[PDB]
């Protein structure tokens, strides 16, 4: 049974998502797409921060814990939130028009190899196959951000208490509202997707470190990307 509190949490996370996700940048053009896609990701980081600030209990963390959680999660949340614009019709992110339509070729021209891109595309396909409710999608984004196992977290106990309330809200939603048999081990498959995102984060960091030790490539980034993903 979904408590008043649990429904309040879902309503809040749905509105936060609606306020910060909508399918100004340098134009789309092996690195030709890095200016455009670095701008897109930079913008997307700002929106992830916007979403995070509206997660019930996130405000009650120290500024230091908020920073470490957003630094560690930002790329995972961007990959995860991108699933809504992703289409299996052509393995592309279709943000409206052919201008802002991104296939394997496009996202392969921002200095990352198929060693990131191929798992990234397979992750989007896997996530489409789960066919999540938007309620489940936004809880998963919130659980992704507020995880007590991120490096540097000071108050793990408060982060864990917040993530446990979100997790309990998700498990309860799945049992009460997700149709069986689609609900069977759905919580476990969602947590596995979070593990896939940590793996994608690891591969991204490794490629980011290499790419961004080429100053000509670092030059094409944004100040926010350099602050969040590092120098």
């Amino acid at each position: 049974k979904l408590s008043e509190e649990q429904q309040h949490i879902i309503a809040i996370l749905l509105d936060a998502h609606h306020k910060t996700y909508d399918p100004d940048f340098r134009p789309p053009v092996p690195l030709s797409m890095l200016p455009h896609l670095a701008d897109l990701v930079s913008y997307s980081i700002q929106k992830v921060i916007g979403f995070a600030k509206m997660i019930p209990g996130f405000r009650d963390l120290t500024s230091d814990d908020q920073i470490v959680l957003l630094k560690s999660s930002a790329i995972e949340v961007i990959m995860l939130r991108s699933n809504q614009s992703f289409t299996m019709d052509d393995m592309s992110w279709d943000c409206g028009s052919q201008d802002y339509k991104y296939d394997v070729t496009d996202v392969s021209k921002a200095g990352h190899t198929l060693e990131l891109i191929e798992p990234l595309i397979k992750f989007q396909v896997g996530l489409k196959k789960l066919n999540l409710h938007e309620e489940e999608h936004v809880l998963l984004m919130a659980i992704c951000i507020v995880s007590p196992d991120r490096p540097g977290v000071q108050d793990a106990k408060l982060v864990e208490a917040i993530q446990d309330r979100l997790s309990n809200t998700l498990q309860t939603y799945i049992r009460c509202r997700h149709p069986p048999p689609g609900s069977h081990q759905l919580y476990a498959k969602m947590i596995q997707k979070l593990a896939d995102l940590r793996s994608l984060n690891e591969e991204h960091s490794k490629q980011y470190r290499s790419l961004s030790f080429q100053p000509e490539n670092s030059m094409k980034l944004t100040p926010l990307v350099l602050e969040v993903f590092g120098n």
Partner: peptide, 10 residues
């Protein structure tokens, strides 16, 4: 060390 993040969090 993260003034842009800090600013966006405010």
């Amino acid at each position: 060390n993260h003034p842009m993040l800090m600013n966006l969090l405010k």
